[PDB]
Amino acid sequence: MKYMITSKGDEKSDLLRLNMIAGFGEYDMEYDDVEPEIVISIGGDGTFLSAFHQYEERLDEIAFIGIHTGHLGFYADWRPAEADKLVKLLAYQKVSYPLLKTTVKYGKEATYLALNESTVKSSGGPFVVDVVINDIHFERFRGDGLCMSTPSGTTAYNKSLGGALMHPSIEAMQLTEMASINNRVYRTIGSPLVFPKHHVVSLQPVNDKDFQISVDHLSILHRDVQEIRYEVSAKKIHFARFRSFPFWRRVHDSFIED
Amino acid sequence: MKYMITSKGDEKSDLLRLNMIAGFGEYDMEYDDVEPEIVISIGGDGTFLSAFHQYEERLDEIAFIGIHTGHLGFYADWRPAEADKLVKLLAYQKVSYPLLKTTVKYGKEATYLALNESTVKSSGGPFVVDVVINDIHFERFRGDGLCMSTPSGTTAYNKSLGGALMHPSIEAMQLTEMASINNRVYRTIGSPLVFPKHHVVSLQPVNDKDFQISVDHLSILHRDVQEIRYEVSAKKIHFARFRSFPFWRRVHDSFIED
Amino acid sequence: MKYMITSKGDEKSDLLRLNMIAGFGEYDMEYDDVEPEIVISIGGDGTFLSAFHQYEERLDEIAFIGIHTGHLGFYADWRPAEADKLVKLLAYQKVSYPLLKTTVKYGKEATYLALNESTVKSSGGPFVVDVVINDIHFERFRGDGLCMSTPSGTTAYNKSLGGALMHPSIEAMQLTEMASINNRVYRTIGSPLVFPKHHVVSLQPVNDKDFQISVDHLSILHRDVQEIRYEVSAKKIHFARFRSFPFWRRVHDSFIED
Amino acid sequence: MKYMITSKGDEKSDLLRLNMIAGFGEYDMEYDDVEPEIVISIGGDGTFLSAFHQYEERLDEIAFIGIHTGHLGFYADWRPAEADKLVKLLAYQKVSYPLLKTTVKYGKEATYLALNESTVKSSGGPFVVDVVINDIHFERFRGDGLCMSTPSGTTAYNKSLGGALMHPSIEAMQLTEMASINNRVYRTIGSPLVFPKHHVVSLQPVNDKDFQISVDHLSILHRDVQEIRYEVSAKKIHFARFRSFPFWRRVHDSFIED
């Protein structure tokens, strides 16, 4: 079975990567980073996020595996001391988490796929957008920006914005506000919004048409923006599962105690 | 077709009720409040909540209809001026919203069904419970109480507690905190938690075993409490639908502008 | 110099109390709990709160001292291992913290003095009050209740309600909301309000006239309530200071790390 | 008495400015924008903010006056229909609001004066700073940024960040967080912090030394930053007062109803 391994780049991650490859050499496993069937990420959630977008065009043939070189992450689910036990079993069950689709239309169009969330901010100055939910005008937002998050991404940026922690078995997307201006004239919903499948959220500019759009770790300035469209993607990221590590248990170890 | 009508009790609600009955007398409609197939509530969301628990034991044979005597509610979806148009069509499609099941075990057991939310508070003094998610200990909560809400109930008590507005097509339940004590020794998740189907949340007492449990509008003191169990119910409330009134549009008219 | 010592009541607090008394017997110190000049509290912040209201009628002749039997409190500023060092020095400087005055008028009048905060809730059912700031109607509050807090009490109940941590050298009082109902028809300020000296906040009933008013740890039902009046008191609690323990350092050790 | 008038630049603001000048021509009033004693701003709070920093070097000889061309602002306190009544009286009492001092030290030093607030953000990538309160390390902040606000500025950016509304008679400054990263390893206070006079808050870089610092409406990138120092300034902005317009009344008309 084809596979590949990404490393955080430090001394501990590179050495653990070469030992797993040496262990895989004792089996019928071929290292191929062009079309692998198992992608192993060694580092942090950002290392896993980089490995996700590195193979986002081949998501239905790949089962991802995360190993945290430092503290426990949400996508990294294996301590470095449990690595030799992995390559053995890797020679299991597959669970799937929802993904967020982001479409940007200018005056072509660009689609994006996010594992954590997608964020829109102002290219300097004020940020004003008309929030449109299923072609119905819902509100005109004024503030710093908005954040549409995946279920697994609710524990990341979505959590710091007052959002709710959502179990990754629910196919949905959550929208949160960033310091919304609310007075007598300007009115936002304030509460986070959770959208089911096939529901389309559209952001439309009022005056400024340039926005600093971010998709997971990446963030690029988009000029002449006509519409930013959010919707739950039909693609799902597949994880390679070898035991029981519940999401709530994983939430407990990251924010409560471990 | 059998039917019945509940009234808020004021002068405007009673007169509108008698006119609909008089209109139903011009059709093949029999008024029966023992086993109706269409339950019409005229008043507010509390009037609809009272009509729900009045017929919670016959939920799969009944399609509910709400008419707001005052401001627009979330379960009341018809202005009084559109009442004659209702009895005509009532002689349509049925949509279903999820419901929350609450089990209370003492030292028998009592089950409850909530349309909005279920809340646990302390019978005087401090409130401490061990939150258990799927038999795994998640946290020990200290504060004023907790609130497990239905999707349609997210716009009610859940919204005022910082919770997220959840679309009623998603079968889930949301838990929120009420002034959680968080210091160096006491640690809660803080963020609201959204649980899918078949996920069981269990509250367990630490010292005090008496709690003021509320299920929608009702609130009764329970003594010698051993476990409070929350889970998405297999029963669903059925609404009688005659046109398009989206949930987000309904949210817009209630909190943004109308 | 006259003095007295209060104990939490457990085994560790009582033994430490008798050793300090034995140590005070080696000096010119007289134990008198009727009119002491130094009040020592051994236990927690609640033990100190009980010792405060035990001598709230003689606040300008007394310097309070706190010793935490368990974890560090905000009013308890001495570990039990530093007790012998206290009675020696106690045979120093005095700092003063602001206090909150609460006046309740019925259909007489009752005044109260709070070290942490004062809270108003509904005697069952809904809670609605008209908030009046300096005889001007500011808002009509709907929800669970309100909380007027002292500067030193901002780290207690005020903190869990989203309030701001206020330095105890500022003579002010902070008001916070408890799950305020906010829609298109009902509108609260939402943000916490910080009132200077001589500013009077008045709560007035709309329909229900019975409220569960709490002043620090105590909470009693008041019937036939006409007005609840909040204002910064002219009385100040005096602490006996023997070294430097800044408030922000004290905040750091309680919520960040210690 | 010398005076000058600033205009928002639109058609309504310029015409009202020329009519007041024509009215001032009927009195012993000299228009001088180099060293005026009365500065009149016609437009919005941003127009007043621009007029403040236009004369921030002569703050003790000037009494500011605000006229809102559109909706009511917090610094604009006069409707355009009450303009002729102003120039008459302007030929009164002076109230003073606190100001925030911001010192930036590099590897010289730059001081700033803010009427609303001062904000620090990351020059791309992550934002990490060590918060130091009176030379004591209080926390290491991770997130989007921080916001130190003046009392009168608490209703602006500070309000949207969950901060508390502070009366402008209290000489203090309030600090708020912007989506703080809080897990098991990273810990912030979360609650807003209110600092009295002579208290110094210092932000220190950890890795990145470039920050996008903003002082009221202005925002400029600062490179090679060694320390960002916040403290309540000894300078106070003086307002020209002709009647009673309480701050809480002014808060009521802006966020509740008007």
Ligand SMILES: Nc1ncnc2[nH]c(C#CCOC[C@H]3O[C@@H](n4cnc5c(N)ncnc54)[C@H](O)[C@@H]3O)nc12
């Ligand atoms: N899924 C997860 N659960 C718990 N922790 C996690 N860390 C990560 C990660 C990572 C790698 O870098 C890119 C990430 O920077 C995050 N981020 C930016 N600003 C903030 C903030 N102010 N507060 C929390 N996050 C923030 C985005 O969300 C994006 O994901 N993912 C998760």
Ligand SMILES: Nc1ncnc2[nH]c(C#CCOC[C@H]3O[C@@H](n4cnc5c(N)ncnc54)[C@H](O)[C@@H]3O)nc12
């Ligand atoms: N679904 C809905 N969406 C928008 N508004 C609604 N009102 C109602 C109603 C009703 C009838 O009385 C019982 C209700 O009192 C609510 N409640 C208590 N305390 C609060 C609070 N502090 N903040 C918001 N609610 C509160 C409970 O939630 C329960 O439902 N239902 C909805």
Ligand SMILES: Nc1ncnc2[nH]c(C#CCOC[C@H]3O[C@@H](n4cnc5c(N)ncnc54)[C@H](O)[C@@H]3O)nc12
């Ligand atoms: N000053 C302080 N700083 C940091 N911790 C402190 N603990 C105490 C104490 C004590 C003794 O019992 C009475 C106290 O119960 C508190 N309380 C009630 N409900 C909550 C809640 N939901 N969240 C935080 N507090 C709460 C009140 O505020 C009151 O003071 N004082 C402080």
Ligand SMILES: Nc1ncnc2[nH]c(C#CCOC[C@H]3O[C@@H](n4cnc5c(N)ncnc54)[C@H](O)[C@@H]3O)nc12
């Ligand atoms: N004092 C006031 N009270 C009530 N409203 C006010 N508007 C103003 C003004 C103005 C002119 O432009 C610069 C201002 O942009 C504000 N700002 C940026 N981002 C936000 C946000 N996300 N939420 C609220 N504000 C924001 C800053 O605070 C700064 O002041 N001042 C006030």
